[PDB]
Amino acid sequence: MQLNQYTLKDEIGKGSYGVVKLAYNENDNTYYAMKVLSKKKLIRQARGPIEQVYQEIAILKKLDHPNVVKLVEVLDDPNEDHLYMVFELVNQGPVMEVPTLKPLSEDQARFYFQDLIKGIEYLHYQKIIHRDIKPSNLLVGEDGHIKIADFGVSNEFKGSDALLSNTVGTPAFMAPESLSKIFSGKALDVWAMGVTLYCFVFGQCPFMDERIMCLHSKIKSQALEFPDQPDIAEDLKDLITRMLDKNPESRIVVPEIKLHPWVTR
Ligand SMILES: Cc1ccc(Nc2nsnc(Nc3ccc(C(N)=O)cc3)c2=O)cc1O
Ligand SMILES: [Mg+2]
């Protein structure tokens, strides 16, 4: 299929909505990742899915950082059902697959976690709360560095932080204060970064249940416990415990994560 200067090829992946296809650009002889979305399918899937897509378009047009995925072009005719989002091509796999029997080593987890810190610090500096941080939304670029993706449920704010009351995101990564109020958006992202880091070294989420009610009660009430294997350093366990503090008041903040001994060694 030909679309403007692009030759559409096979399906290579999926977004939270839409399919990703390989797209050859005839003008610069470079390949791109093209996310193909049906407006009709987004409407039937119902901030609903179509509002999530247009939020992401609006956020990604304003951002420029080495740890944020690059949106190159949007093809959207208002009288056509399909809209196309063209991104810089990255690795086919994300930072890691979850659940996995082969989790990251501690050096690799530190390297990717340092990228995640830089990316989240930039987003927070740009007044954006991501709200869906997880390994499958952490792409890996040609440079070998993390590129944050999926801005569909993000929130922009004016002032020092976002003071929010709604529950959005991926259930396994949602902070306990959002499942029981007004709460800090930055601390929600810190909790999800904690669930992500736990996933990097254990290959599984810290709180898991097939039943969404039970998953939520575990996030709110199950004390954090580390598996016996793999053995991980005490400083890493200490950092994860502080990021997965159920009380957002006492949860570690990003400036403090940057001075944590596991991060600085
Ligand atoms: C053989 C091969 C095949 C594929 C790839 N690369 C990709 N595969 S899948 N999706 C990608 N990029 C996105 C963009 C946005 C979103 C999103 N969630 O908005 C997710 C992934 C890729 O660049 C690389 C390869 O050498
Ligand atoms: Mg991999």
Residue numbers in the entry: 160 to 205, 227 to 360, 364 to 448
Provide the publication's sentences verbatim.
Protein kinases catalyze phosphate transfer from Adenosine Triphosphate (ATP) to tyrosine, threonine or serine residues in specific target proteins. CaMKK2 is predominantly expressed in the brain, with trace expression in peripheral tissues such as the testis, spleen and lung. In addition to recently being linked to appetite in vivo, CAMKK2 is over-expressed in multiple cancers. The knockout of CaMKK2 can reduce cell proliferation and tumorigenicity in vivo, making CAMKK2 an attractive drug target.
Diffracting crystals were obtained with compound 2 in complex with CAMKK2. The CAMKK2 kinase domain adopted an active state conformation in which residues of the regulatory and catalytic spines were aligned; residue Glu236 within α-C helix directly contacted Lys194 (“α-C helix in”); and residues Asp330 and Phe331 within the conserved DFG motif pointed towards and away, respectively, from the ATP-binding site (“DFG -in”). The ligand displayed two direct contact points to the hinge region of the ATP-binding pocket: one involving the oxygen atom of the thiadiazinone moiety and the other through the nitrogen atom of the hydroxymethylaniline moiety. A water bridge made by the nitrogen atom from the aminobenzamide provided a third contact point to the kinase hinge region. The co-crystal structure revealed that the oxygen atom of the aminobenzamide interacted with the catalytic Lys194 and made a water-bridge with Glu236 of the α-C helix and Asp330 within the conserved DFG motif. Likewise, two water-bridge interactions connected the nitrogen atom from the aminobenzamide moiety and residues Ser175 within P-loop and Asn317 at the bottom of the kinase ATP-binding site. Finally, the ligand aminobenzamide ring made a T-shaped π-π interaction with the Phe267. Compound 2 is bound to CAMKK2 with aniline groups in a twisted conformation relative to the central TDZ ring, as can be seen in the electron density map. We noted that STO-609 can displace a bound water molecule from the ATP-binding site that is still present when compound 2 is bound to the enzyme. We demonstrate, for the first time, that the 4H-1,2,6-thiadiazin-4-one (TDZ) chemotype can function as an ATP-competitive kinase inhibitor.
